[PDB]
Design a protein around this ligand. Structure first.
Ligand code: AOS
Ligand code: AOS
Ligand code: AOS
Ligand code: AOS
Ligand code: ZN
Ligand code: ZN
Ligand code: ZN
Ligand code: ZN
Ligand code: ZN
Ligand code: ZN
Ligand code: ZN
Ligand code: ZN
Lengths: 426, 419, 419, 421
């Protein structure tokens, strides 16, 4: 099944083929003079994948308003159809991350559709930061760390159910992010709340298959505006170390305090074997959830520099579960995810260009200037040709968004899906 | 009419009257030893009012969820009834701030309900940061600064409508806060978007009554996550200055960058005559919209210190509009607004205690330690007795929240209103 | 006696009447709240915080240093000044030394301390600056420097600090270093940390059985891109890796903007790694300002966590309390006096918190009453308690005013030549 | 010449081949994009940024200063090192002086500058530190100090800076002061600012007809509670109040965390008060790190605003750019060289933006394509352009490599005595 007509992809690829060959060959020659085999780089890029969030193909909003576009997906099945477009064009997003109960449906169907669309399933995502219809206990004052035992049990039960759904569709991990925290000093006893969280998470841990992982995700604030139980990587580390070997930490780019050195957190988690994976996006003020690399592309590169450094050396078990976690409020969700997945592969490719041996030498000699310049020589390289050729060689589009717009896909689904209404948030 | 039974108020006041007399008399003796007449302070405190936001009367939420409590107001009229409780108990919130179209309803009836409940109306608040039913042009990419002329005109017209509603109920000001901005570099041309905004605001100013003020509110980010047209007080000053004498700047405490010295911004605006008013609330991370003084009470005091100093310096024509702008996500909105109004009067009261003569002396002599200690001697003073007595003498409750709960008001409206 | 006893007596008597009135008034108010003021005063008078030897001299920035008169010429003058702080506040019996700044014959330091009635807190090592005759520079790091010989030199320096501390009565070594990078790529984050861990393991081996090793994290400065011990997470990994004797020190001004510092304190306590505190205040970065001068509520909330620990019955909880400030525009002695006072102030207020009520409100998720329970304690002016604690222990009712009446500064100015 | 010509020629020839390949390849790619590489290079070789005389010496923090070898002592040694940066990058023909640090006979300063092929940019006054024999201390402020005699002393000092500047070819005075408070209540915000404005009015009166007075805002440090000239808002009030010759200086690292600095640049340009931009980079505060070493995209976004205005020559838009950094762990000359390079890099990339296309995507509210239009320019590796520009103007293809090959540092190390060694 091809969401995007093959004729359109071929047409748009041929229209740009000539320019691509010129740019690829020019870059190839430049890299050659730099002792780098462009083909080796392209080969790895072609194999780099990042999961797409099911809740990301729909238009997002803020607490102030939501301005939906046309052809908004009705549910998981429409979302999968849309995710298929992203994968077909970029070839960098073969897997989709589901969120329950948003995407709750017959596991068999989900699996059937994914298979037909050529999509797999990444980490499951539980939802105890909002109340569902007919829910017995409200999560207003928390969930896994709520002071009421019944509420915690209900939360634990929900997460276990997410694991059951995941096993039936091919998932191998559960990502746990909660809003648990407080808005006022004194409202929560920091320690007791955390103790309650660890005990509940230990219950969820018991329901994990032997080849499954449990990812806890920290966030400094929002929805909690005074304190958050899992507020930073420090608390996250304590959680993972306490729960067990299958418990690891997820680092979401926009979940840190202003000016935080995020790439260091990545290196620390790697050093202690607790880097479960990433949640890519970009930001300038808070948890903005913007398109990856749209605000600080260098920071994205620096994070990948830590990832590649580890990938280059003795790769223990190092297999971080990478996923995109963004909100598209003023763009066509599909186009944003396409360029975001592209930016991630861009950062990765540039990180692969780093002369590791030279960098090591400058680090040992404390030649700070040359060390940073060694990183910049890689970062400054325009690897777009590598990314475009990788897509072309794997059945993708040279220029994904251009092909997407040429296909008229959005107008198509807009004519098949019911209209949406603009609204608020809170 | 009284939303809260008068016998409950009297009862809960008598129950605490003895202790209050003890604390008030003790504080009185302490202030007298400091050369301060406690009566002069109480008199000023009972005259300090801050407007309550109609949109803060119902439970608030985030982009992740909203967890409504019981007895949620069904509309503006229920909201006015709840606002009447806040005023009755604290006596510090006689006026309500309306937001259109959220509170759109027959102005004539709003006025009638207000008068009956003993409530007045503060500044009107326009809303072009969200789309309304049947709206011709979406504000997705902006409003007053939108690239499309027809959209900007529609936004201007909406603001003029807000003025018409306000004139009918006795409002004398229009506050304009928009989300206009960009989420990506390059999406907007900073200068052209600002030029469009200035031109639209000029049209609104043209339609502003000569007995009204026009307040522009700056905000660093949210809903825009890369750039915001009216992002800080600098741009806000340029706006007010450009528009005219009737245009001023509104300062919302949670709308500034991390570590910003907000009290300095307040002083700067006062010095150049553009401090239109305040939107009180507290915060720790961003525009958290938490109960005022719940996070950084000293900062709140420092802001009031600049307000009181303005009077001491002889600044004239200075009558800032005071308004609360908060979101109550995990508490009873009424109780939060009650304690927030209380906290604001608390900071004001402490600012009144500052020995201006001593402070001035320490500032001229560059005695930093004693200057800061002079501020602390005021801030460290527990003025709760003054706050409680002010309420008691004006028909309010010694302990507002305690009386509120003792009245069972929440359960009452929970029964009258759906779930 | 650094300050004449007749001066202390005279100033105490001059303020005795007002102290009596305020204390008794507060005593009655607390009694009505079910609190025994005598019990609070008894604990307050036993709360001690170490004074930094390096804080008695005027501090500066990279732009300039503006010394005052009578700057101490060395460690002995510094101890003399520290004795003034202790005599007047009775809250700072111990001094924290820094090597090599305070290097001197251990026997003489001990003798001077005993003579002045002062003890010694944790020793502090210095590998963030180069001393004369140093075989290796710390320009690119110390304990984590790529060069093995440089790390060895840093280790030996720390071992020397322990030897000095053992001779004077110290029972801990605090390690803060500037190690980090100013450019991406300059350092391999993991290898630099591994080098640090190896060096610290060596230092740990030289620890007596009753000693502790405190590592102090800092987000930035002097390193402006990355810092090896950048936050509490890395700090926890250090203490856990080193062993039972290794704990973490939390310096209030060393965290990222908006960080919830009190939570960090609670987390470290829960896992038994809260070695101690470095008290100070700040608004922008590691400003090192007088404790409580900027965010007094935050200071109170940190103490609320320390007191709750005691309430929860945490076993063997004896954090080391120390002031770590820089006094750039005030008399260092006066700032340390009022800073020690602010710390006792926040501690006293934390003791006033009705834990029983708080426990109930936290259980029932009554956020508003829970926060109001904390506020009822924080808003209480405990100055009378602090003042009476000093009176009873031979200190001054108003420390700074007594200091000024003594003419001490002028005295030492005439005795000490400016360099 | 500070650096031997044969060394420059040798290191250029060594890299000439690869440069031709890369330059011709980029010229071809740009041609396909409808851009003439030559037009970009012609402008790049004419883009200059002043080097701070105080930037060639090793910087330090309040904890320590770790000097390298051959540290320049005094303005003459400093000019000698600044000449190296200019000869190799050809992007820093002018030096910014600081008084009293660089105090010396004007005639001699002018002579040494002409001899080295260096001019002089804005003068920089210093009332944030006390000089020996000073009548009044600046401990509690300078231009806004409560003591009248102290303000008068600060004003006279600034006037003296103007006199020195007039004698050496300078056409502006930059005023950055530490004035502020470390404690609430210590200063009366309004009165302090009034005193400042009054003192600046006096300095303004001493300005020649063709001179400019630049005020520089800073959120904090050395003042840790409040700063008189804390941000661009206050800065704008200053410039607007003083007159046509007064403008604002924007120092990248002087803003609150997460501030949108490029917007501040746009606002000032719109109102004709952008006097100049002080380049450096940062991650935490006023770190004063090498430009573009931390956030190169932000630097590009700032230049996007500059180029936009430079193309439409806005009224009052003639910014005086300068590098204002502190080099604590690198060879200062090498950092200034690579920082000047980064500045021209961001300038070159901003010059590549398809303004027509961008304006089109902005009007249609196509946020994705608008941001991608900026990225297409930013992702372009313009090093071949910067290198050819240097090669054509007498500089080095690879500045730092040529500097190291010359052995300059070892040379001045042998000529200048270190404190110990
Ligand atoms: O802020 C929320 C985190 O990003 C979580 O990963 C969350 O579940 C996700 O964003 C979906 O809302
Ligand atoms: O963030 C928005 C500002 O606080 C405005 O005053 C706004 O109108 C108010 O918050 C209502 O949502
Ligand atoms: O910032 C440095 C830390 O506070 C250290 O404790 C340091 O040793 C202290 O400031 C004295 O320099
Ligand atoms: O921080 C100070 C500013 O950068 C000034 O421009 C200053 O004159 C220079 O950087 C050094 O004093
Ligand atoms: Zn996430
Ligand atoms: Zn998030
Ligand atoms: Zn507001
Ligand atoms: Zn707001
Ligand atoms: Zn410290
Ligand atoms: Zn510090
Ligand atoms: Zn500067
Ligand atoms: Zn600076």
């Amino acid at each position: 099944e091809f969401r995007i007509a093959q004729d359109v992809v071929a047409r748009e690829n041929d229209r740009r083929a000539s320019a691509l060959k010129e740019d690829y060959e020019a870059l190839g020659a430049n890299l050659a003079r730099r002792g780098v085999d462009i083909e080796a780089v392209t080969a790895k890029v072609e194999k780099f994948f990042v999961a797409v969030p099911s809740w990301g193909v729909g238009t997002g909003g803020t607490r102030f308003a939501r301005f939906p576009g046309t052809g908004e997906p009705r549910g998981i099945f429409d979302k999968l159809d849309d995710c298929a477009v992203i994968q077909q064009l970029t070839r960098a997003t073969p897997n989709v991350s589901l969120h329950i109960p948003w995407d709750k449906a017959d596991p068999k169907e989900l699996k059937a559709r994914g298979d037909a669309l050529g999509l797999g399933f990444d980490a499951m995502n539980s939802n105890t930061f909002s109340d569902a219809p007919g829910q017995a206990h409200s999560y207003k004052y928390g969930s896994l760390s709520h002071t009421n035992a019944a509420t915690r049990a209900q939360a634990v039960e929900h997460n276990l159910e997410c694991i059951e759904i995941g096993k039936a569709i091919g998932s191998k991990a559960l990502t746990v992010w909660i809003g648990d925290g407080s808005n006022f000093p004194g409202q929560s006893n920091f320690t007791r709340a955390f103790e309650r969280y660890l005990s509940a998470m230990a219950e969820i841990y018991k329901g994990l298959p032997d080849d499954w992982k449990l990812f806890s995700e920290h966030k400094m604030y929002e929805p909690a505006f005074y304190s958050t139980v899992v507020q930073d990587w420090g608390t996250n580390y304590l959680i993972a170390q306490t729960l067990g070997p299958k418990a690891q930490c997820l680092v979401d780019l926009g979940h840190h305090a202003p000016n935080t050195n995020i790439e260091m957190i990545v290196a620390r988690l790697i050093q202690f074997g607790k880097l479960g994976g990433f949640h890519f996006n970009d930001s300038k003020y808070g948890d903005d959830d913007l398109d990856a690399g749209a605000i600080e592309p260098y920071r994205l590169f620096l994070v990948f520099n830590e990832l590649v450094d580890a990938e280059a050396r003795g790769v223990k078990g190092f297999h971080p579960a990478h996923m995109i976690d963004q909100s598209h409020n003023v763009t066509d969700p599909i186009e944003s995810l396409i360029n975001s997945a592209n930016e991630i592969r861009r950062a990765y490719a540039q990180a692969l260009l780093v002369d590791r041996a030279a960098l090591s030498g400058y680090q040992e000699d404390n030649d700070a200037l040359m060390a940073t310049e060694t990183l910049k020589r890689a970062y400054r390289t325009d690897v777009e040709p590598i990314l475009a050729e990788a897509r072309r060689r794997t059945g993708g589009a040279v220029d994904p968004v251009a092909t997407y717009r040429a296909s008229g896909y959005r107008a198509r689904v807009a004519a098949e899906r019911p209209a949406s209404v603009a609204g608020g948030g809170g």
